[PDB]
Amino acid sequence: STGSATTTPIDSLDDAYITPVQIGTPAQTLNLDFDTGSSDLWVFSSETTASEVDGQTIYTPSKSTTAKLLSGATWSISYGDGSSSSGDVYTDTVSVGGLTVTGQAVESAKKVSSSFTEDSTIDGLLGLAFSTLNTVSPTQQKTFFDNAKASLDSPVFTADLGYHAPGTYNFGFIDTTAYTGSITYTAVSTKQGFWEWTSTGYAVGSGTFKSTSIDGIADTGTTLLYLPATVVSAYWAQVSGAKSSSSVGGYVFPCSATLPSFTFGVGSARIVIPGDYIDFGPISTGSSSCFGGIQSSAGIGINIFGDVALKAAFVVFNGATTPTLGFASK
């Protein structure tokens, strides 16, 4: 089997991407944030505290003839940005882009934090990291990819995120028309439950490539590119007027600037992030100070290749017995 679904930016900054997902019988279609940095499939639902729902589409399990309460199961998750959600669990039929999994754990939110409530465009998350991170208790549950893997033509999914434009998530096959050149594959550690790999270095604009190992995670659920303070300082030093602002919470730069590109290494290959991809616009409406898309990881504890980096590439998440990641230019 295979599946193929279009993923669409939620706003003009590409702050996140939503992909339609069919849940239950008859189908209830919710727009979920596919997140390779977490491992829970959770949804706004008929059980969510009413004051915490503000425009999202909800899953109503009582209207699904295939929904079954997973008795005793609860879940509770906290994300790197400080947001959180929790609830109980059903199993139901879930389809993405024509690919169907029966018996998928669908985590129904009873509570969500304010940032979820405030984002009317995201109806939940679909986690695509390793199932060892799933928060369901007392019986941990498998991700959608883990459940579908055996049925897929090839045990892979691919992320092809657009810059200010729609893109595609494919399951079970590699679309050779979707990228240029060849795919360079690189080793993955699953020891922290993430798609964790080691970049071989970086360049800033037309500058020379610096060979240096940068361990980090491929995370479609994080907007920006978070890298060590040395690397980020070297980038922003090439932008006149750029500075790190503690009051804003990161590097800002004059909105009048033209940003340099940023290159990251994948083995001997190179992925170029155009400068425009690093512009996240005014810090507040009407300001001439703009927020940078490359930020320091020093306060996180891990480097994060988020959407800013991933959308410059065609990315293969290879879930073979020894997982690997692949990157191609496009």
Curated annotation (Swiss-Prot):
Keywords annotated in UniProt: Aspartyl protease, Disulfide bond, Hydrolase, Protease, Signal, Zymogen
Protein EC: 3.4.23.22
Disulfide bond residue pairs: 255-290
Reactions catalysed: Hydrolysis of proteins with specificity similar to that of pepsin A, prefers hydrophobic residues at P1 and P1', but does not cleave 14-Ala-|-Leu-15 in the B chain of insulin or Z-Glu-Tyr. Clots milk
GO biological process annotation, one example: proteolysis
Active site location: 35, 199
GO terms assigned for molecular function: aspartic-type endopeptidase activity
Residue ranges constituting the Peptidase A1 domain according to the UniProt record: 17-328
Record-stated family: Belongs to the peptidase A1 family.
This protein's name: Endothiapepsin
Gene behind the chain: EAPA
